[PDB]
Each structure stands twice: as structure tokens, then as C-alpha cells.
Amino acid sequence: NTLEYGNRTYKIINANMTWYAAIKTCLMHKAQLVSITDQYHQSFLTVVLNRLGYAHWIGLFTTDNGLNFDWSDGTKSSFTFWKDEESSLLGDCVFADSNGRWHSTACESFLQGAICHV
Numbered sequence: 521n522t523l524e525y526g527n528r529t530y531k532i533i534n535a536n537m538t539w540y541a542a543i544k545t546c547l548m549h550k551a552q553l554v555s556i557t558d559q560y561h562q563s564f565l566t567v568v569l570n571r572l573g574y575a576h577w578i579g580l581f582t583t584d585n586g587l588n589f590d591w592s593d594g595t596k597s598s599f600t601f602w603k604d605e606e607s608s609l610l611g612d613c614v615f616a617d618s619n620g621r622w623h624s625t626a627c628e629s630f631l632q633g634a635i636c637h638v
């Protein structure tokens with residue numbers, strides 16, 4: 521499913537995927553697992569997620585036990601949208617819940633969605 525917002529094209533994937541498989545699946549659709557750099561793009565995706573009702577992988581990850589989180593598509597930005605204190609602490613790869621808020625978890629976990637953008 522393809523959506524437009526701002527000057528951005530989003531693709532919403534519904535498939536059983538680990539975070540690594542979401543990286544792959546987005547690329548197979550000529551896109552990249554999403555980076556979320558401000559409150560406006562976040563609010564657009566919150567509406568999308570709340571209408572779908574289930575968690576989607578996003579392109580944020582850490583290799584230093586959560587000291588630093590980076591976007592897989594290379595974007596540099598200060599914006600964060602964590603659910604709570606604990607959510608930044610629980611794992612290496614990040615998803616957005618059905619209310620748009622971010623959580624970290626094991627990259628080998630399975631979710632049924634990913635958000636990509638071009």
C-alpha cells in the first residue's frame with residue numbers, strides 16, 4: 521500500500537518479518553525502512569498505524585546496547601518518539617506500536633508490518 525505525505529512516498533508492508541527481513545523487503549520494493557525525523561511525519565504515521573491496529577518495524581537500531589540509535593537509511597536527526605523510559609532499553613531494533621510510539625526489541629522478533637519510504 522502506497523501513501524504520500526509531504527514530499528515523501530510511504531509503502532506499508534503487511535508480512536511476517538524480522539527487522540532484518542523488513543530491511544530486505546523494503547529494498548525489494550525500491551524503498552528503505554522508514555526514518556522519522558519530525559513530528560509531522562510522525563503524526564501522519566500515527567494515523568496510519570492506529571487505523572491498521574498492529575505494530576510495524578521502523579528503521580532505527582543500535583549496535584552499542586542503546587547508547588546510540590541510528591537510522592538504517594542514514595538520516596541524521598534528533599527526533600525521538602519513544603513510548604516511555606523502558607521502551608528505549610529493551611532491545612536493539614525498533615518498531616512503532618498501534619499508537620505510533622516507539623519500542624525497542626530483539627531484531628529476530630517477528631512483526632506483521634513494516635513502514636518503508638522512498
Ligand SMILES: *[C@@H]1O[C@H](CO)[C@@H](O)[C@H](O)[C@H]1NC(C)=O
Nearest residue numbers: 535536537538629630631632
Ligand atoms: C513468522 O515466521 C516465523 C519463521 O518461519 C514462524 O516461526 C512464525 O510462526 C511466523 N509467524 C506468523 C504469525 O506467521
